[PDB]
Design a binder for this molecule. Structure first.
Ligand SMILES: C[C@@H]1Nc2nc(N)[nH]c(=O)c2N2CN(c3ccc(C[C@H](O)[C@H](O)[C@H](O)CO[C@H]4O[C@H](COP(=O)(O)O[C@@H](CCC(=O)O)C(=O)O)[C@@H](O)[C@H]4O)cc3)[C@H](C)[C@@H]12
Ligand SMILES: C[C@@H]1Nc2nc(N)[nH]c(=O)c2N2CN(c3ccc(C[C@H](O)[C@H](O)[C@H](O)CO[C@H]4O[C@H](COP(=O)(O)O[C@@H](CCC(=O)O)C(=O)O)[C@@H](O)[C@H]4O)cc3)[C@H](C)[C@@H]12
Ligand SMILES: NC(=O)c1ccc[n+]([C@@H]2O[C@H](COP(=O)([O-])OP(=O)(O)OC[C@H]3O[C@@H](n4cnc5c(N)ncnc54)[C@H](OP(=O)(O)O)[C@@H]3O)[C@@H](O)[C@H]2O)c1
Ligand SMILES: NC(=O)c1ccc[n+]([C@@H]2O[C@H](COP(=O)([O-])OP(=O)(O)OC[C@H]3O[C@@H](n4cnc5c(N)ncnc54)[C@H](OP(=O)(O)O)[C@@H]3O)[C@@H](O)[C@H]2O)c1
Ligand SMILES: NC(=O)c1ccc[n+]([C@@H]2O[C@H](COP(=O)([O-])OP(=O)(O)OC[C@H]3O[C@@H](n4cnc5c(N)ncnc54)[C@H](OP(=O)(O)O)[C@@H]3O)[C@@H](O)[C@H]2O)c1
Lengths: 289, 288, 288
C-alpha cells in the first residue's frame, strides 16, 4: 500500500519544512492539519487505526510538529492515549526540529569525546528553550553532570525540573544573567553547548579557548553573531588547539539526514515511538555510519 | 493523467478516515477542504469541470463527507447543481460512513434472506440517525414493510417523512420509549436492525430469540454493550437456532471494502453519482 | 527527488483549478495554503530553501495564486524578498490565471500582426481588470500606443498608472461609458482587445468590421454574449474580410499549454521567476 504520513501541527498551518523532509524520508503522501489539540486529535488518530489491517497498518504513520514543544508533547501524549491493543501506528514528535537538532548535536559531541561523557561537567548556556532542554536530557542520560543555564533562576529551574521528570534525570539549574556569568559558568566544564535564540552570541572566543578543562564546544545558532565566538557555523569537529568545535550547520547536516531516516523508520513497523530517546539512539548509529 | 480526488468536508477539517480509504480506493492524489458549504462549493466544482477535456475528465472526481448528513446532502445537491451538459465529474456522498455502512448492512441481510425481503416486516430500532434512516430507505426500496422506531414519535415520524420524500418509499414510524416497547415492536418482524448510538443495548437476547417470525438480526453498534444481546460483533450470518445474526464488525468489514470500491468507480466515468441507491447497488454485487 | 510545489493562495482556501493544472503541469505533490500574506509567507519560504541542497533544490518550487492580483503581487514580492544568495527556488505568480491568459492573447495578436505592433494604436476595452491591465502592460512593452478603457475615467486612469509604474511604460486611459463611446474609441485602432468580465458584449460586429485601420481583434470572454460580436469563441486568427480574429477558446488553447510549461520549468532550475514578462517571453516562443 501507499505510505501515508498524517502531519499534526499545533500552529495555524502545517510546517512547510516538515513536509519537504517527510517526502525526502519516503512518504508517498503527506496530509497536514493545523490547529491540532489534545481534544481534536483523537478523531484524526481513529482515521489512522481503523482503516487498514494487519501488515497494511505500518504503511500509515503520524508526525506531530509545530513551534511550541509543550503543545506538541500534549498532542503526542493524546495520540499515544488513543491507541489501544493492536489499534496503533508508528508516530514521531519533532516540534520545530527540536528533537532531531538536539539528538544530532549530542550524538556528534559524545562521539567526538571518545564515546563517553560520564561523570564530566556539561554546561548548556541558554538551555531553557526546547533544543537546550532536550540537549540537557540526552547529556544527563549519558551520565554527564549537566548544568542548564538561563538569565533567571526560576525559568532555568523550571526547565531542569521539567527535563528531570520527563527523562528521570538530575540536571541542575544556574542563573547566568550576563556575558560575565556565562564565562564563569563554563569554568571546569568539559563540554559546552550554546542553545540560544537565533542571532545571539553567548560565549566569546576568549571565554572558552583559555579554559583547560573544555574538550568540545557545540553551537546551535547558525545566524551571525554565532552562539560561540571564534568558530565557523560549518565546523564539524574542527580542531582549535587541543579542543574541537561543532557549529550549527555542521550539526544541521546530520539533523536533516536523521529527520529523513526517522520518517523512513515510521513505515517499517506500526509500533514505533520516535521521541528524543529513540531519535537519539538512531542519531548515534548514524554518527558511526 | 493522475486520478485526483477532491474531498469536500462540512466539518472544520477533512476526515482522516476518508483520506486513507480514498487512497486505498486508488486516488493518486487527495486534496481536502473543510468548512465546505452550498455557497463556496460552486467555485471548487468549477475547478474540476473546466481543467481537463475528453477522456481525461473522468480522472478528476469529488467526495463529500463530514459528521452531519443533512449538511453533506446540501453540499452534494449544490455540487450536482453546478454541473451542466458534459461539464461534470463523478461524485460520491458518504458523511460519517453512513451510506456505506447502511448499504453493507442491508446488502448482507437481503443476501442472507435468500435475495428478497419483499412483503416482509423489517423493524429498525433507533432508526432516526443517518445509518437507521438510510437502512430504512434501502429496505423499503427492496419492498420490505419498514417500521422506523425511536424514543419519541415526533422525531421517528419526521425521520420516516424525510426518507419517504427523498427515496419515494412508504416507511412508517413508531414510538418505542424503553426496552419493553422495543421488545413489543419486533413481534411479527422478519428482519430486525439496531441502528442505535454507540455503546447502547436496544434488544436483549430474550427479546428476539423466542420470536418465531424473526429470520435475521443486524446490529451497527460495535461498542459493548452491543445493540443486540446474545451475539458477537464479528458475527456475519452466524446461526442462532433457525435465525441468523450480523454484528457491527461483520458488517463493517464489507463497508470498508465497499467504500474503497466506490472510490475506484469514480475514476471509470465522469458521470457517476454515488449516493445511497448506487452505493447499495454495488454492495449487492460485492456480497454475491 | 520528488517535484514538490508549494501553492500559496491569498483566498481562504487554495484554488482547485490551480491544483489540477499544477498536477497536469508535472508537479509530483502539491501542498496548498490559504490566507497567505506578506507577513506569514516568510516562514513558508524558509521551509523551501533550507531543506534540500545542491541539485535537489530545483525539485521544490512556489506557485502564488488567488482571486486578487494586487494581493498576489504583495505575496510574490515577499517571497522574492525572503530569498538570499543561493537560498532560493523557482516561483510563479498567476492569480486567477490572469498572467497566462494575457500572455497567450498578446502573443497571438503580435505574431498574427507580422511580429511587430510598434507605433500602432492598440485599444483595450474594459481594460481595468487584471487580464486587461496585463494585456496593456505587454502591448506597451511591444511599443504599441495603448489606450486602456473603462466606464469611468478615474478607474481607467488608476489602472493605467498602476501598469505604467510596474512595467515602466506609458499607457493612456479613456472613459467609454457605453456602446457608442466604445465604437468611437476603436476608430483609428489597428489592434482591439475585449478584456471584459464574463458574459458581456463590448464590441458589436458593425463597430469593428467597417473600420479600415483595424487589423486584428481578440476577445478573452468565452461566455455568450461574447466580448466581440460576429466571431466564434474558437476562432484563432480566422479571416473576416481582410481582418483576423481570436476568440477566448482560441487564446485558451495556448494558455493551457503555457501554464503547464511554466509549472514544468519551475523544476528545471532553482532561479526561475514567472511573472508577466517571463510568462510572455515563453508564450511568444510557444506560439511559433
Ligand atoms: C527555519 C527552519 N525551520 C524549521 N522547521 C522545522 N519544523 N524543523 C526544523 O528543523 C527547522 N529548521 C532547520 N533549519 C535548517 C536545517 C539545516 C540547515 C542546513 C544544514 O545545517 C547543512 O548546512 C546542510 O545540510 C549541508 O551540510 C554542510 O553544511 C555545514 C557542514 C556540512 O555538513 C539549514 C537550516 C532552520 C534553522 C530551521
Ligand atoms: C471512527 C470511524 N470514523 C469514520 N469516519 C468516516 N468518515 N467513515 C467511517 O466509516 C467511519 N468509521 C468507520 N469505523 C470502522 C470501520 C471499520 C472497522 C473494522 C471492520 O468492521 C472490520 O472489523 C475489519 O475490516 C476486519 O474484518 C473482520 O474483523 C471482524 C469481522 C471481520 O469482518 C472499524 C471501524 C468507525 C465506526 C468509524
Ligand atoms: N538547524 C535546525 O534544524 C534547528 C532547529 C531548531 C532550533 N535551531 C536553533 O537552535 C537554537 C536554539 O533553539 P531554541 O528553539 O531552543 O531557542 P529559543 O527558545 O528561541 O531560545 C533559547 C533561549 O535563549 C535565551 N535567550 C533569548 N534571548 C536572549 C538574549 N537576548 N540574551 C541571552 N539569552 C537569550 C532564552 O533563555 P533565558 O530566558 O532562560 O535566558 C531562551 O529560552 C536557535 O538558535 C535556533 O535557531 C536550529
Ligand atoms: N462501521 C462503520 O463504519 C460505522 C459508520 C457509521 C456509524 N456506525 C455506527 O452505527 C450506529 C448508528 O450510527 P448513527 O450515526 O446513525 O447513530 P446516532 O445518530 O448517533 O444515534 C442513532 C439513534 O440512537 C438513538 N439513541 C441515542 N441515545 C439513546 C439512548 N440512550 N437510548 C435509546 N436510544 C438512543 C436515537 O434515536 P431516538 O432519539 O429517536 O430515540 C438516535 O437518533 C452507531 O452505533 C455508530 O457507531 C458505524
Ligand atoms: N480561460 C482562463 O483561464 C481565463 C482566466 C482569467 C480571465 N479569463 C477571462 O478574461 C476576461 C477578463 O478577465 P478579468 O478578470 O480581467 O475581468 P473582470 O475584472 O471581471 O472585468 C474586467 C472589466 O470589465 C468591465 N465590466 C464589468 N462589468 C461590466 C458591464 N456591465 N459593462 C461594461 N463593462 C463591464 C469592468 O471595467 P470598468 O468598471 O472600468 O468599466 C471590469 O474592470 C473574462 O471574460 C474572463 O472570464 C479567462
Amino acid at each position: 500500500s501507499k505510505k501515508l504520513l498524517f502531519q499534526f501541527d499545533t500552529d495555524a498551518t502545517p510546517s512547510v519544512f516538515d513536509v519537504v523532509v517527510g517526502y525526502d524520508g519516503g512518504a508517498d503522501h503527506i496530509t497536514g492539519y493545523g490547529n491540532v489539540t489534545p481534544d481534536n486529535v483523537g478523531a484524526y488518530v481513529d482515521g489512522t487505526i481503523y482503516t487498514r489491517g494487519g501488515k497494511e497498518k505500518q504503511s500509515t504513520a503520524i508526525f506531530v510538529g509545530g513551534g511550541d514543544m509543550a503543545a506538541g508533547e500534549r498532542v503526542f501524549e493524546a495520540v499515544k492515549k488513543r491507541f489501544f491493543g493492536p489499534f496503533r501506528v508508528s508516530c514521531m514528535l519533532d516540534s520545530n526540529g527540536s528533537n532531531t537538532t538536539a539528538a544530532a548535536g549530542v550524538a556528534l559531541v559524545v562521539k567526538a569525546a571518545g564515546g563517553s561523557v560520564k561523570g564530566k561537567k556539561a554546561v548548556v548556556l541558554a538551555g531553557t528553550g526546547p533544543v537546550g532542554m532536550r540537549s540537557a536530557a540526552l547529556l544527563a542520560g549519558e551520565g554527564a553532570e549537566v548544568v542548564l543555564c538561563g538569565r533567571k533562576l526560576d525559568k532555568a529551574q523550571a526547565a531542569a525540573d521539567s527535563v528531570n521528570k520527563r527523562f528521570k534525570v538530575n540536571v541542575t539549574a544556574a542563573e547566568t544573567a550576563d556575558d560575565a556569568s556565562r564565562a564563569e559558568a563554563v569554568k571546569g566544564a568539559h563540554f559546552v553547548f550554546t542553545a540560544g535564540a537565533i542571532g545571539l552570541e553567548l560565549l566569546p572566543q576568549a571565554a572558552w579557548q583559555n579554559e583547560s578543562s573544555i574538550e568540545i564546544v557545540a553551537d546551535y545558532n547558525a545566524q551571525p553573531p554565532l552562539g560561540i565566538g571564534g568558530i565557523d557555523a560549518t565546523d564539524k569537529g574542527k580542531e582549535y588547539g587541543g579542543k574541537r568545535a561543532f557549529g550549527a550547520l555542521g550539526i544541521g547536516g546530520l539533523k536533516l539526514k536523521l529527520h529523513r531516516a526517522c520518517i523512513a523508520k515510521l513505515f517499517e513497523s506500526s509500533e514505533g515511538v520516535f521521541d528524543a530517546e529513540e531519535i537519539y539512539k538512531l542519531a548515534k548509529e548514524m554518527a558511526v555510519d
